[PDB]
Design an enzyme around this catalytic site. Structure first.
Site, PDB file in Angstrom:
ATOM      1  N   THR I  30       0.636  -1.228   0.093  1.00  6.89           N
ATOM      2  CA  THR I  30      -0.254   0.058   0.058  1.00  6.89           C
ATOM      3  C   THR I  30       0.740   1.239  -0.156  1.00  6.89           C
ATOM      4  O   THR I  30       2.030   1.168   0.354  1.00  6.89           O
ATOM      5  CB  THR I  30      -1.008   0.010   1.158  1.00  6.89           C
ATOM      6  OG1 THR I  30      -0.241   0.023   2.292  1.00  6.89           O
ATOM      7  CG2 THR I  30      -1.894  -1.409   1.180  1.00  6.89           C
ATOM      8  N   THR I  31       0.183   2.311  -0.480  1.00  6.94           N
ATOM      9  CA  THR I  31       0.832   3.657  -0.359  1.00  6.94           C
ATOM     10  C   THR I  31       1.167   4.244   0.840  1.00  6.94           C
ATOM     11  O   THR I  31       0.339   4.258   1.647  1.00  6.94           O
ATOM     12  CB  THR I  31       0.448   4.547  -1.275  1.00  6.94           C
ATOM     13  OG1 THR I  31      -0.131   4.083  -2.585  1.00  6.94           O
ATOM     14  CG2 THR I  31       1.025   5.970  -1.720  1.00  6.94           C
TER      15      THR I  31
END
Ligand code: CL
Ligand code: CL
Ligand code: CL
Ligand code: MG
Ligand code: MG
Ligand code: MG
Lengths: 204, 244, 221, 195, 231, 241, 195, 250, 243
Positions: I30-31
């Site tokens: 995920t970012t």
């Protein structure tokens, strides 16, 4: 309970003209009790002679140890160890047990096979070397031997004369020590012959 | 991880052989021939140096014949470096025994222990075995004169006469042919040299390509002498037997 | 009695030659001046075995260090290695040392206590004769001493110890380490205690000693 | 554990060992055998700290019995004594040393000679014609110095031992409840049934 | 393929295959359900038998008075991890006189599982756990996976055909979350949830295994005739 | 071919893992240069900050190992920092044990011996870095000693490292043929930096702004790095001549 | 006798020059002021061996700290001293005063007494057997003093201590830690005695 | 973590070859030529100083190393492997001999210890053999002058004269013709410079040639006077100037 | 070939393929972002809501080290936790000996050396996380980003995970448009926006925003989570910007 004076006994070494002499008493005791009158304190590894006074178990143990070490030396070097080198080996081996020492007063005597120079040395129990021209003393009658040697000794004695001097030095020292005597042995060491004489002395 | 690069030096083949032991024996078969012959009154050790160079210092050289104690010697066949590791171990084991019992180590006891070290390297540790075969020539007061061999497997056996290294097949046939039980040392010396002379891969057997040793009772009254022959002494014994 | 004296272009160390067990003199001419390195010398007091052993171990390690670095060894290295070794054993190794030498940095004079403390000085003294020696040093030491002045002061300080201290005696040993020169070791520099002629000769008539048995010892193979 | 004697005569070695085991103010036993057979022609008597004595004796016995099986050979008395000495010499610089004193009597079949070895707890070994440990020696050694003869027979040696035991029973403060006597000769080890 | 020999080797797409194979052991394992309200947290487990002569493999292990889990996959690995949780719960009590937070229990299992995925010679754990507990911040349900990933949830399910029960809980979320101060009704919702993961076989008396913890309820396991009420 | 995966000999007596470690050296695409003055040793390295989000002050391949020793690394920053931390540890330990500041050449030898072990022991990989150690040694004077993944090290009159190493090397070789001496006959370190930059510009054929360069200077009893403003002042001096 | 005083421009460290074994002065020109960093110094009291061993280790830790993290705080130097003194309190007998100058924090003084505790003070003084005084003329010391005032204050304080001690004696050594740098001052008996 | 390589990386192949030793010897063959000649009154060891770069200071890299005052060593093969072997050789001369007997070891026994270290790299877990052959020249009172070669296997042989590395085959032939048992030290140095000129291609002077002798004792190099028995080191490294003097009368 | 089968093995290029494979695991994650501001740092992360059954606000991914350092990572979450655990041991041992809380650069190298160590042996696997971390020390604000190779640098802004290229582009605009500097409260709002813009590359599942910050003025130099009104204010700002 002083390990150096339980079993008792003495060693003395002297230099002469192209010869050395080393002598010891034959007594092993348990304090007051005389146990053995055949306890020799002089051993030889090739042409290098070692006398050891002090705790008898350590005398036996160090003999067995230096036989071991000199046997391996000879196999690897392909020649018998010399007195000067053996002295350094005794010193090394004692100081290795600095904080758990062998209770002994070793004395090295012999002639360097190359230079022909008479050599004697003494050590304390942790291996400090006392290198001396004249004489070395060890054991329970060391004070007595120092007195006898310092008065009787003169330089460049012939083998037959040196025998009389070291013999008289030992016998008269042993007779003033309770834990020394019960017979004596004198080694006269020339470059390529060694005579071993048992002395007649008082058995008390 | 590291599993990828492990040769697994201590495993069985499907036929139940030890790969690394078999390959070590193959290594030893290319090494200079060593012969031991046991007589009634002594033992002979003879070994061939590996293709000598003219500028090799011959007199102050030790490749094949090593002293373990005053009563026991070995002839080496294989990696010299590997042999020296084992020889120093054997020399220490002999002095340990002398220190403990105040008696010279019986020959078989020294051989068994050195053989047991080799065995260990084949069963555990994951290391390559010692690429060495020994001929042990010794004397003790129990069995008298004795010849043994050990190999990388750690197996050892006793012999009246034996060879290790190159051309053992040929050497063993010649020894089996000419050997007899009432043989003297002087006769055994002649047999050892004649055998090397015929099995050698060299054009002619010369003093400079040989190491020689005898264990006799030649010293005065019930004592054993180890004679590691000098170059000039090999030259003389080689002329006396009429090989040069 | 051991002393160190700094002069213009170097340092000088001197010592007596008496070894003793209790009140008995074991050695009348023992050498208390040790070579750690060719131009780094040590004077030792206390347990004789300990001073020799600690001097040889550091001397060995200094030689290996010198080979590794391709440089002449420094006195501070010998000092640092000695003090850390002695500190580790909490005074159980009874070595009291005067460490003096010349190296690329210059000339240095240090003392080391058995517990691992070190000091810096122009003049130092250690052992049972230190107070006798230090009295001479405090009386006669001056700044900008010449080499000839420094040797005299050092040997005089040892002499004070020899005469007035029962633990010290026999001869005087000196080692001179000058910058840009080979260290010169003057063994038995002074011999002011020569035994006088004996009144009589105690050489015995041959056959005086009674002999039970004789035998020839075989030392050959 | 108090009295252990040894006499080496012409053709045998005789070991005499006290039968009494005393703990506190009571004599627990009056038939205790303070000896172990190390090999068919080697016997070891022992005295010292309780437990340590038997533990040490049995440990030595096991090691010699192991050597005998491994080599199918009887170790010489000299060899056994040297082994035992080295074990005691290790003990003395241990965390807790074995406080055991031993006599080793053996017949060497190679030399056809009887041998007696005296080793104390420190590992102090000595070869003697006659030996003892603790206070035993103080009364018996003067007697042996006087009556002992080197070419004595086994019967002569037993009579000389009776004289030692009689002197000990007269002048010693403890009742050691007599001695078990064992002879070691060319034929092996046997116990004198009545003494 | 070439990158699944051990747990110390990444694949060219950045995957740990030994971990993914360990995850597969859980899918083969029998279904277990977890769900909670604000007051209570419930574990429901379908126990599996070898045959009709055999017993039914116990799925639920108690860790403390306020915490326990259900297992799916290698049972011996559940024993190792549950024993570790027991010790950490016990350490918290003895040293700090403090009941171990369910969140910290998760963090400790995660970190233990992780070390077995980065070291050569060792293997990942081959089991998934559903941890329920009641601590100082109320009811809690955790999902452990032997990758090390731990997740706090209102409800979930793991094992064969778990997707059925997980879909039901996703729909029912708003209903069962508000079952406060009513144990039996929250269990009923858990039993109706696991029922969505059944094929051919139905819930019997020695087949069903239920556990519950809550505000004034120690972690207790119901088996045999005790779960007859909920069939 | 597992003889290319670990540090064991290939049939032609080569260590491929060592040779591949040398190729990792140029992964950064940065060129370094070291020269000696009378009183000083100057080391310059290219500074490339491609990302706009990077804090340029933290992007450095020059390390203050001790107070007298500086070290520039050609290779990836992880292995650079591994070597830097170890060199810092070794320099500090040396001073404690032997009571004087570790010489530049002795640290070089020590780091080279560590590198050698990685080429002989299988479980350890070589570091993909070339370490250039600079100081004004109190015995030897201005000193440059350079280490590589093979465990090789030697002293240098001057040296260059990186992709365009050979071009910088021949540029310096030609200067020392002409000047007929083993150093830059210049009083101030400022003018020795001006020489180093000038000869890098002539060799690489590129111009430099204040942010394109990174400069380390060793004087007697200290090694320091120049700020952007210290370099800018130095670039102005070159331009005005 | 050792003391460290913080003033306007930084801090000053002062001590006597006498080392004793019993009643014998082993060194009458001892340097009791030790550099652990350029502008972090300490005063050593207790065992000469123990304080030297500790001071050498702390110097090593700060040299390593400076290499990795840059110039360390006086508080950091005090913490390293304490850690060695506290953890090895059973085997150590060392009392240390740490004085250092930061451009941020100016002059700071920390004392590590025999316990192995740490205390930050405006000034500190130790006499006899590593004995720190809490008051020591609190109305004679004011915050933000002058260099000469500070030098005069320490010179007087140490002179009084040498007049009544015997442990303390010889010359007075001082080290002045400021932004300007490090200054070494020395006062011979003839100057300081007539006070 | 940890060294998991506790197994041999050198094993017997079906042909009975030890691959890693054979390959190590191949690395030695690629190495720069070095040689040794034994005279009646000394020993000479010599090698080319193959300079990596002309900017490099070839003085700093020492191919000929003092091991003890009376023993010197030169090599062919991998320089780094030689440097760590010299370090280990100097230390073992102290730990296993000098600190026991109070004297430096004889040539054959120090050689034996170096050989042992190299044999261990042949059998121990997780290590390759050393990629060098050593020529060790030395003197000791009871054996006199001696010259030994040590190979990656750990095998050592005594030589009257020999060569190792690039042009060893040709160099050994040259030495066979020139060597006799009546050679003085100066004659052996002369032959050494003649032998080495064949194997060197580029510049041949005192700056590109490294040469040391085991000869007479050097009191001037001892660094102190006063002990008559200490007469100084027998190992002397010839200077750049001393080599150039003997190249004029060549 | 087979140079990619074992960690710590150099390819003929001079590359460690196993480290490059670990980066793929990071890119898959995920970012997560970091923004350096006037007097501190801001951290933000994308939490994918896999199911309704996930408890909101109760699966915290941002971890604190000591009291002054924030840590966020993308990739194998357990590997990140292992690295933070080590970071806490390093920060504890530093404070124990040197008293002062570990400076950020000092702390950066401690993680750096540890991660690099997991590329030296084949017995270990490289870390499958890029770690964005930082905080306030005596010398001011510091933001760092650390990669599986052990490589780390100082940053004005940092981004890693599936939406890194989108986040990097939005970070580069902030650096250009605010040369004199960005405030702490501004950086929280901008962090929210960038995560929402970066969520376009991961838009199958909806997500939950999580922000933390260290500011000399706003948090008194300590690490705190953004909660309640300040979190909802940042979400509202981000929601207004996408539309
Ligand atoms: Cl740095
Ligand atoms: Cl090293
Ligand atoms: Cl002091
Ligand atoms: Mg008498
Ligand atoms: Mg006795
Ligand atoms: Mg390797």
């Amino acid at each position: 309970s002083d390990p150096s004076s339980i079993n008792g006994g003495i060693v003395v070494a002297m230099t002469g003209k192209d010869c050395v002499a080393i002598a010891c008493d034959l007594r092993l005791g348990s304090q007051s009790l005389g146990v053995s009158n055949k306890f020799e304190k002089i051993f030889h590894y090739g042409h290098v002679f070692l006398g050891i006074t002090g705790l008898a178990t350590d005398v036996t143990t160090l003999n067995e140890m230096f036989r071991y070490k000199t046997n391996l030396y000879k196999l690897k070097e392909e020649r018998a160890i010399e007195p000067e080198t053996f002295t350094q080996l005794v010193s090394s081996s004692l100081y290795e047990r600095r904080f758990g020492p062998y209770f002994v007063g070793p004395v090295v005597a012999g002639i360097n096979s190359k230079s022909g120079k008479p050599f004697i040395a003494g050590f304390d129990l942790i291996g400090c070397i006392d290198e001396a021209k004249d004489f070395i003393v060890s054991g329970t009658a060391s004070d007595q031997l120092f007195g006898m040697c310092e008065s009787l000794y003169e330089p460049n004695l012939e083998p037959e004369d040196l025998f009389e001097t070291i013999s008289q030095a030992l016998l008269n020292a042993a007779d003033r020590d309770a834990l020394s005597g019960w017979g004596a042995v004198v080694y006269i060491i020339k470059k390529d012959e060694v005579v071993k004489r048992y002395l007649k002395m008082r058995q008390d | 991880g590291s599993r990828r690069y492990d040769s697994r030096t201590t495993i069985f083949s499907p036929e139940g052989r030890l790969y690394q032991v078999e390959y070590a024996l193959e290594s030893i078969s290319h090494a200079g021939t060593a012969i031991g012959i046991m007589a009634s009154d002594g033992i002979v050790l003879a070994a061939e140096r590996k293709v000598t160079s003219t500028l090799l210092e011959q007199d102050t050289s030790t490749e094949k014949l090593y002293k373990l104690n005053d009563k026991i010697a070995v002839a080496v066949a294989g990696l010299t470096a590997d042999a020296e590791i084992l020889i120093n171990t054997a020399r220490i084991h002999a002095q340990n025994y002398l220190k403990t019992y105040n008696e010279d180590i019986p020959v078989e006891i020294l051989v068994r222990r050195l053989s047991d070290i080799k065995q260990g390297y084949t069963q555990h540790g994951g290391l390559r075995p010692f690429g060495v075969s020994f001929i042990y020539a010794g004397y003790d007061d129990r069995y008298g004169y004795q010849l043994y061999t050990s190999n990388p497997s750690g197996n050892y056996t006793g012999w009246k006469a034996i060879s290790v290294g190159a051309n053992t097949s040929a050497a063993q046939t010649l020894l089996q042919m000419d050997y007899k039980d009432d043989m003297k040392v002087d006769d055994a010396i002649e047999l050892a040299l004649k055998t090397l002379s015929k099995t050698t891969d060299s054009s002619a057997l010369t003093y400079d390509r040989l190491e020689f040793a005898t264990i006799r009772k030649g010293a005065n009254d019930g004592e054993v002498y180890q004679k590691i022959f000098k170059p000039q002494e090999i030259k003389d014994i080689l002329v006396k037997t009429g090989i040069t | 009695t051991i002393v160190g004296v700094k002069f213009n272009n170097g340092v000088v160390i001197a010592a007596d030659t008496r070894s003793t067990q209790g009140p008995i003199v074991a050695d009348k001419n023992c050498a208390k001046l040790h070579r750690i390195s060719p131009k780094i010398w040590c004077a030792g007091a206390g347990t004789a075995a300990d001073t020799e052993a600690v001097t040889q171990l550091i001397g060995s390690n200094i030689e290996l260090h010198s080979l590794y670095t391709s440089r002449e060894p420094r006195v501070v290295s010998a000092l640092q290695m000695l003090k850390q070794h002695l500190f580790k054993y909490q005074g159980h190794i009874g070595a009291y040392l005067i460490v003096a030498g010349v190296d690329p940095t210059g000339s240095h004079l240090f003392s080391i206590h058995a517990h691992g403390s070190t000091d810096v000085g122009y003049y130092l003294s250690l052992g049972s004769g230190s107070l006798a020696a230090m009295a001479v040093l405090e009386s006669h030491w001056k700044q900008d001493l010449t080499k000839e002045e420094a040797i005299k002061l050092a040997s005089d300080a040892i002499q004070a110890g020899i005469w007035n201290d029962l633990g010290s005696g026999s001869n005087v040993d000196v080692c001179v380490m000058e910058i840009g020169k080979d260290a010169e070791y003057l063994r038995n520099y002074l011999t002011p205690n020569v035994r006088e002629e004996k009144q009589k000769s105690y050489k015995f008539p041959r056959g005086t000693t009674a002999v039970l048995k004789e035998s020839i010892v075989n030392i050959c193979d | 554990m108090d009295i252990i004697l040894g006499i080496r005569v012409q053709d045998s070695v005789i070991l005499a060992s006290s039968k009494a085991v005393t703990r506190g103010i009571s004599v627990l036993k009056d038939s205790d055998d303070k000896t172990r057979q190390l090999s068919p022609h080697t016997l070891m008597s022992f005295a010292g700290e309780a437990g340590d004595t038997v533990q040490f004796a049995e440990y030595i016995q096991a090691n010699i019995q192991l050597y005998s099986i491994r080599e199918d050979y009887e170790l010489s008395p000299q060899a056994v004594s040297s082994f035992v000495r080295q074990e005691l010499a290790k003990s003395i610089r241990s965390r807790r040393p074995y406080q055991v004193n031993v006599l080793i009597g053996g017949y060497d079949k190679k030399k056809n000679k009887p041998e007696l070895y005296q080793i104390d707890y420190l590992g102090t070994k000595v070869e003697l014609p006659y030996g003892a440990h603790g206070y035993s020696g103080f009364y018996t050694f003067s007697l042996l110095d006087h009556h002992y003869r080197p070419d004595m027979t086994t019967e002569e040696g037993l009579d000389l031992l009776k004289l030692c035991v009689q002197e000990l029973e007269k002048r010693m403060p403890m009742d050691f409840k007599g001695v078990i006597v064992k002879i070691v000769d060319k034929d092996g080890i046997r116990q004198v049934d009545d003494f | 393929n070439n990158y699944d020999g051990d747990t110390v080797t990444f694949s060219p797409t950045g995957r740990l295959f030994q971990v993914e194979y360990a995850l597969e052991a859980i899918k083969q394992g029998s279904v277990t359900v977890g769900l909670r309200s604000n007051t209570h947290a419930v574990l429901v487990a379908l126990k599996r038998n070898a045959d009709e002569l055999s017993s039914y493999q116990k799925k639920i292990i108690k860790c403390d008075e306020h915490m326990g889990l259900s297992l799916a996959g290698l049972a011996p690995d559940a024993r190792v991890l549950s024993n570790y949780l027991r010790q950490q719960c016990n350490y918290s009590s003895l040293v700090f006189n403090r009941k171990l937070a369910v969140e910290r229990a998760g963090h400790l299992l995660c970190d233990k599982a992780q070390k077995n995925t980065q070291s050569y010679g060792g293997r990942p754990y081959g089991v998934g756990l559903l941890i329920i507990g009641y601590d100082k911040s109320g009811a809690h349900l955790l999902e452990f996976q032997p990758s090390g990933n731990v997740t706090e949830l209102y409800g979930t399910a793991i094992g064969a055909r778990s997707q059925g029960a997980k879909t039901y809980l996703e729909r029912t979320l708003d209903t069962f979350i508000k079952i406060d101060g009513n144990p039996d009704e929250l269990i009923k919702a858990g039993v109706e949830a696991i029922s969505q993961s059944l094929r051919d076989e139905s819930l019997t008396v020695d087949n069903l295994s239920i556990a519950i913890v809550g505000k004034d309820t120690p972690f207790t396991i119901y088996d045999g005739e005790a779960v007859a009420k909920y069939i | 071919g597992y003889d290319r995966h670990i540090t064991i000999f290939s049939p032609e007596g080569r260590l491929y893992q060592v040779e591949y470690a040398f190729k990792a050296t140029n992964q950064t695409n940065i060129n370094s240069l070291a020269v000696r003055g009378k009183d000083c040793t100057v080391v310059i390295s290219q500074k490339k900050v491609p990302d706009k989000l990077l804090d340029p002050t933290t992007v450095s391949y020059i390390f203050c190992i001790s107070r007298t020793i500086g070290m520039v690394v050609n290779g990836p920053i992880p292995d650079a920092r591994n070597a830097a931390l170890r060199a810092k540890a070794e320099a500090a330990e040396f001073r404690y044990k032997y009571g004087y500041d570790m010489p530049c050449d002795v640290l070089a030898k020590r780091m080279a011996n560590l590198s050698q072990i990685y080429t002989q022991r299988a479980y350890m990989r070589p570091l993909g870095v070339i370490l250039t150690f600079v100081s004004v040694d109190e015995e030897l004077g201005p000193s440059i000693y350079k280490t590589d993944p093979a465990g090789y090290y030697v002293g240098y009159k001057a040296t260059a490292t990186g992709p365009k190493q050979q071009e910088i090397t021949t540029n310096l070789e030609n200067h020392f043929k002409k000047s007929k001496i083993d150093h830059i006959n210049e009083e101030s370190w400022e003018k020795v930096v001006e020489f180093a930059i000038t000869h890098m510009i002539d060799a690489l054929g590129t111009e430099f702004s204040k942010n394109d360069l990174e400069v380390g200077v060793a004087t007697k009893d200290k090694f320091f790095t120049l700020s952007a403003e210290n370099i800018e002042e130095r670039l102005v001096a070159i331009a005005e001549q | 006798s050792i003391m460290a005083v913080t003033f306007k421009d930084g801090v000053i460290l002062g001590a006597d020059s006498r080392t004793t074994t019993g009643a014998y002065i082993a060194n009458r020109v001892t340097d009791k002021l030790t550099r652990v960093h350029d502008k972090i110094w300490c005063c050593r009291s207790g065992s000469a061996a123990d304080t030297q061993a500790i001071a050498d280790i702390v110097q090593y830790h700060l040299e390593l700290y400076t290499s990795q993290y840059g110039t360390p705080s006086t508080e950091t130097a005090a913490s390293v001293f304490k850690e060695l003194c506290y953890e090895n309190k059973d085997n150590l007998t060392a009392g240390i005063i740490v004085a250092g100058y930061d451009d941020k924090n100016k002059g700071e003084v920390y004392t590590i007494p025999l316990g192995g505790s740490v205390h930050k003070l405006p000034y500190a003084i130790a006499v006899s057997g590593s004995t720190f005084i809490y008051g020591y003329c609190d109305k004679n010391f004011r915050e933000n003093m002058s260099k000469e005032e500070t030098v005069d204050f320490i010179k007087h304080s140490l002179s009084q201590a040498i007049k009544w001690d015997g442990s303390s004696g010889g010359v007075i050594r001082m080290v002045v830690l400021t932004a300007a740098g490090v200054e070494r001052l020395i006062f011979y008996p003839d100057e300081y005695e007539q006070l | 973590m940890t060294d998991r390589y506790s197994f041999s990386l050198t094993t017997f192949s079906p042909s009975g070859k030890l691959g890693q030793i054979d390959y190590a010897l191949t690395a030695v063959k690629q190495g720069v030529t070095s040689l040794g000649i034994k005279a009646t009154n000394g020993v000479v060891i010599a090698t080319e100083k193959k300079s990596s770069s002309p900017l490099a200071m070839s003085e700093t890299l020492s191919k000929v190393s003092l091991l003890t005052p009376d023993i010197g060593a030169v090599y062919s093969g991998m320089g780094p492997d030689y440097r760590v072997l010299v370090d280990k050789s100097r230390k073992v001369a102290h730990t296993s001999y000098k600190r026991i007997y109070g004297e430096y070891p004889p040539t054959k026994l120090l050689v034996s210890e170096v050989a042992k270290i190299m044999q261990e790299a042949t059998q121990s877990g997780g290590v390759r053999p050393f990629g060098v052959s050593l020529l060790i020249a030395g003197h000791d009172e009871f054996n006199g002058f001696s010259l030994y070669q040590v190979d990656p296997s750990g095998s050592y042989f005594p030589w009257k004269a020999t060569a190792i590395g690039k042009g060893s085959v040709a160099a050994k032939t040259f030495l066979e013709k020139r060597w006799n048992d009546e050679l003085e030290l100066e004659d052996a140095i002369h032959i050494a410079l003649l032998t080495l000129k064949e194997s060197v291609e580029g510049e041949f002077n005192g700056d590109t040639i490294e040469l040391a002798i085991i000869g007479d004792e050097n009191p001037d190099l001892l660094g102190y006077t006063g002990i008559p028995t200490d007469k100084g080191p027998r190992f002397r490294k010839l200077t750049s100037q001393e080599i150039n003097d003997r190249l004029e009368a060549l | 070939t087979g140079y990619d089968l074992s960690n710590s093995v150099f390819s003929p290029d001079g590359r460690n393929f196993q480290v490059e494979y670990a980066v793929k695991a990071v890119e898959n994650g995920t970012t997560s972002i970091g923004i350096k501001c006037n007097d501190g740092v801001v951290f933000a992360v994308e939490k994918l809501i896999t199911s309704k059954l996930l408890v909101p606000q109760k699966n915290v991914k941002i971890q604190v080290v000591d009291r002054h350092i924030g840590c966020v990572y993308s990739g194998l979450i357990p590997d990140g936790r292992h690295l933070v655990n080590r970071g806490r041991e390093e920060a504890a041992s530093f404070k124990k000996l040197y008293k002062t809380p570990i400076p950020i650069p000092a702390f950066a190298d401690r993680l750096g050396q540890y991660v690099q160590a997991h590329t030296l042996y084949n017995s270990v696997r490289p870390f499958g996380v890029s770690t964005i971390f930082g905080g306030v020390d005596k010398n001011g604000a510091h933001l760092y980003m650390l990669e599986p190779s052990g490589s780390y640098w100082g940053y004005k802004g940092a981004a890693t995970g599936k939406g890194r290229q989108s986040a990097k582009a939005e970070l580069e605009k902030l650096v250009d448009h605010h040369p004199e500097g960005l405030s702490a409260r501004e950086a929280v709002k901008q962090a929210a926006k960038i995560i929402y813009l970066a969520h376009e590359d991961n838009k199958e599942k909806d997500f939950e925003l999580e922000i933390s910050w260290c500011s000399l003025s706003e948090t008194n130099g300590l690490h705190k989570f953004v909660k309640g009104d300040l979190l909802q204010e940042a979400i509202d700002f981000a929601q207004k910007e996408i539309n």
